[PDB]
C-alpha cells in the first residue's frame, strides 16, 4: 500500500464524539485510542490529517472492516471523485481546492469519507481544512447536527465543501472583473498569459465539478439503506448547489474566453503607419542623397567657377523636390 | 419536480433573472366570432376571472420583474411552481413542455 501524493510533512488525528447531551474533543497521536469509538451508539467523527504514514490507515481499515482496495483508493490521491456503496459502509472520494489571489494558481487536495455504523472516517492529505463551520456547530449547540446520526454529519461535511467551492467562485469572480477591466483599459503582455491561465483553471474546475455532481446525484437519487430517507432532501439541496456551481463555471468560461479574443482583435494593425513613415522618409531622402553626392564626387571636370550661386540653387532644387514629393503624398493622402 | 434549491435564498423563493425592471402592464384581449373585448390594466384581479371563459382569451403580462403577479397567475391557473421558475429564468434556450 503505497502513497502517491506529495504531502509527507505532518500527521494528526482529530476525534469529535458528540450527542444530544455533551460532546468530546481531543487530538490524539496514538492510534489505539480511536478504535473503541466504533461501538458507541452516538455519532462520532475521526479526522485523519495525515495519510502518508501508511500503518495508521492500514490499521484503521482493518479494524473497521474496510476492503484493502478501498484503502488503496484512499491512498491514491490522483483519483477522480466517486462514490461506491457497500453493505457495511459508504465510501466517498472528494476534492479540496484552495485559490490564491496573490498568485493565480489552482491546486487540488483529495479527501475521503467512510460512513460505516456511526463513524465518519475522514482521511486528509495535509493540514488546512474546509469543515471548520461544522466543528463550530458541533462544539456549541447551534443546529440539527447534534440531534441526528452520522449520515447528517456526512451531509454537513459535503455541504461545507460546497460552501467553500462557492467562496472560491467569489474570488474567481473578482479576478475576472479585475482582468476584464485591465484588458479593456491597459493591454499588456502578461495579460494574455493571465487570461489563458484563468481559462485553463476554469476548465479544470469544470472537469472536477462534474464528478462531484455525479457523487451527489448518486447519494440522493438512489438512497442506500445506510443513508436513511430522512436525509435525502438535504443531499438534493446540495445537488442543486452543485448545479449552481456548474452553471457559474460555464458562464465564467464563456466570458473569459471572449476576453482572450479582445487582445487578438486589438493587435496586428500597427504595421501600416510605421511602414508609411519609413516609405515616405526614404522616398524623400534617397534622391536628395544621390544628389549632393553626384556633385560632391570631387570629379573636378565641371568648371570650378561658382556661377550664379550653384550651391544655393542646388539647395533650392532640393527644396523643390521635397515640396513636389510632399504634394504627391498629399494627393495620395499619405 | 420541486423548486431548485439556491444557496443564498430562502427556500421556495422565485426570482426574476433578467435586467428590465421599468414597465409593467397586463392587456387582456377576449374575442369570439361575433364580438371582442380589448382591455388593459395594472391589476391582476381584473384578469383572473378569464380562466373559465368559454371564448378564446389572450392575456399578455408585460413585465416579469413583478414576481407577485406571476405567482398569483400561476396559482389561479394551476401552473406548477417549476414552470413559474422557468418563466422567470431568462438565461434559457427555447423549449416546450407538455402537461396534462
Amino acid at each position: 500500500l503505497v502513497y502517491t501524493g506529495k504531502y509527507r510533512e505532518d500527521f494528526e488525528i482529530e476525534v469529535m464524539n458528540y450527542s444530544i447531551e455533551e460532546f468530546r474533543e481531543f487530538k490524539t497521536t496514538d492510534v489505539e485510542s480511536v478504535l473503541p469509538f466504533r461501538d458507541s451508539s452516538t455519532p462520532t467523527w475521526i479526522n485523519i490529517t495525515g495519510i502518508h504514514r501508511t500503518d495508521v490507515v492500514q490499521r484503521v481499515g482493518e479494524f473497521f472492516g474496510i476492503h484493502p482496495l478501498v484503502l488503496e483508493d484512499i491512498l491514491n490521491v490522483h483519483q477522480r471523485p466517486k462514490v461506491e456503496f457497500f453493505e457495511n459502509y459508504v465510501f466517498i472520494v472528494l476534492k479540496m481546492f484552495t485559490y490564491d489571489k496573490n498568485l493565480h494558481e489552482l491546486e487540488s487536495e483529495q479527501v475521503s469519507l467512510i460512513l460505516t455504523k456511526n463513524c465518519v472516517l475522514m482521511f486528509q492529505e495535509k493540514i488546512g481544512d474546509v469543515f471548520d463551520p461544522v466543528r463550530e456547530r458541533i462544539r456549541y449547540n447551534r443546529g440539527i447536527i447534534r440531534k441526528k446520526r452520522a449520515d447528517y454529519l456526512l451531509y454537513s461535511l459535503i455541504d461545507a465543501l460546497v460552501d467553500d467551492y462557492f467562496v472560491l467562485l467569489e474570488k474567481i469572480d473578482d479576478e475576472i472583473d479585475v482582468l476584464e477591466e485591465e484588458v479593456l483599459e491597459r493591454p499588456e503582455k502578461e495579460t494574455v498569459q493571465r487570461t489563458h491561465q484563468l481559462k485553463r483553471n476554469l476548465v479544470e474546475l469544470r472537469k472536477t465539478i462534474w464528478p462531484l455532481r455525479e457523487v451527489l446525484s448518486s447519494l440522493y437519487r438512489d438512497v442506500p439503506p445506510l443513508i436513511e430517507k430522512e436525509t435525502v432532501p438535504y443531499f438534493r439541496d446540495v445537488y442543486d448547489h452543485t448545479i449552481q456551481i456548474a452553471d457559474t463555471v460555464e458562464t465564467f468560461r464563456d466570458i473569459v474566453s471572449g476576453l482572450l479574443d479582445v487582445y487578438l482583435s486589438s493587435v496586428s494593425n500597427k504595421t501600416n503607419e510605421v511602414m508609411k513613415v519609413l516609405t515616405i522618409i526614404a522616398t524623400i531622402f534617397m534622391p536628395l542623397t544621390f544628389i549632393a553626392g553626384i556633385y560632391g564626387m570631387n570629379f573636378e571636370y565641371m568648371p570650378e567657377l561658382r556661377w550664379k550661386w550653384g550651391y544655393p540653387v542646388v539647395l533650392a532644387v532640393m527644396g523643390v523636390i521635397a515640396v513636389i514629393m510632399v504634394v504627391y503624398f498629399k494627393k495620395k493622402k499619405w | 419536480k420541486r423548486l431548485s434549491a439556491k444557496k443564498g435564498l430562502p427556500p421556495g423563493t422565485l426570482v426574476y433573472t433578467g435586467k428590465y425592471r421599468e414597465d409593467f402592464e397586463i392587456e387582456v384581449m377576449n374575442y369570439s366570432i361575433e364580438e371582442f373585448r380589448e382591455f388593459k390594466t395594472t391589476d391582476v384581479e381584473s384578469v383572473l376571472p378569464f380562466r373559465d371563459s368559454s371564448t378564446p382569451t389572450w392575456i399578455n403580462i408585460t413585465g416579469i420583474h413583478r414576481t407577485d403577479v406571476v405567482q398569483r397567475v400561476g396559482e389561479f391557473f394551476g401552473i406548477h411552481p417549476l414552470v413559474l421558475e422557468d418563466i422567470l429564468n431568462v438565461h434559457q434556450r427555447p423549449k416546450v413542455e407538455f402537461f396534462e
Partner: antibody
Amino acid sequence: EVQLVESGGGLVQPGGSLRLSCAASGFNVSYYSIHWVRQAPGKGLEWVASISSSSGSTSYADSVKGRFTISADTSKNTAYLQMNSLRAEDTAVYYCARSYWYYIWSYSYGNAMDYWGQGTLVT
Amino acid sequence: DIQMTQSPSSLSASVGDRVTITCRASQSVSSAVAWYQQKPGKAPKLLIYSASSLYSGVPSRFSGSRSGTDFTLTISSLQPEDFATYYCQQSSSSLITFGQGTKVEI
C-alpha cells in the same frame, strides 16, 4: 400605491420590551422580504433583521441577535419586531422596508430595498 | 461580517461639477452593492443596485461602477437636490451591512 406604515414606537425603560408593527399596503408580505433598519441620532443606517414571510426564514444582526425576534402575520399583512432587553445603544429611528432579489450570476444573488417606511422613534 | 468603508466622510462640491464617492468592502462581495440617498428627516431612497444598474425613476446623472472590491458612486452634474448623505451596503450574505455615509455639502 405601495406603502409601508410603521407603529409601536415609544419611550421604554431599559430592560423593557415593546413590539414594532409594520403595516403593508399595496403588496403582500408573502411574496417579498421585509427588513428592519435602525438609524441612531447622528449615525448611519444599521441593519437589524429580515424575514421572508413565505417561508420561516429569518436573519438577525450580530449586535441584536437573541434579543430581537422578527415575525409576520400573512393574514394581517403586518411584520413585527419583538425587541427585548433594550439598552441605551438600542435607541434609534427604526425603518421598515421591503426588498426584491436580483440576479448577478448563478451562484450570486443580491437584494435591494426599493420601498421604505416613514420611520418611528424608540428610546 | 463584511465591513464597508467610505471615503470621504464628508464632501463639498458646487453645482454642475463631478462628484465621486468610493466604497470598499473588507471581504469579497460580487456585485450585491446598492446606493441610497437620504435627505435629513426622511427615509432613504434607492439609486443604484447591482453596483452598476440604475433604479427606475432615478435621474440619469447618478451612476455606479465596480473594480474588484472597489465600488464608486458618481454624479455627472450636481444639482441643488443632490445634497444629501449617501450609503453603500452589501447583500452578498444574509447579514446586510451598511456604510458609514458620505454627506455632500455645498
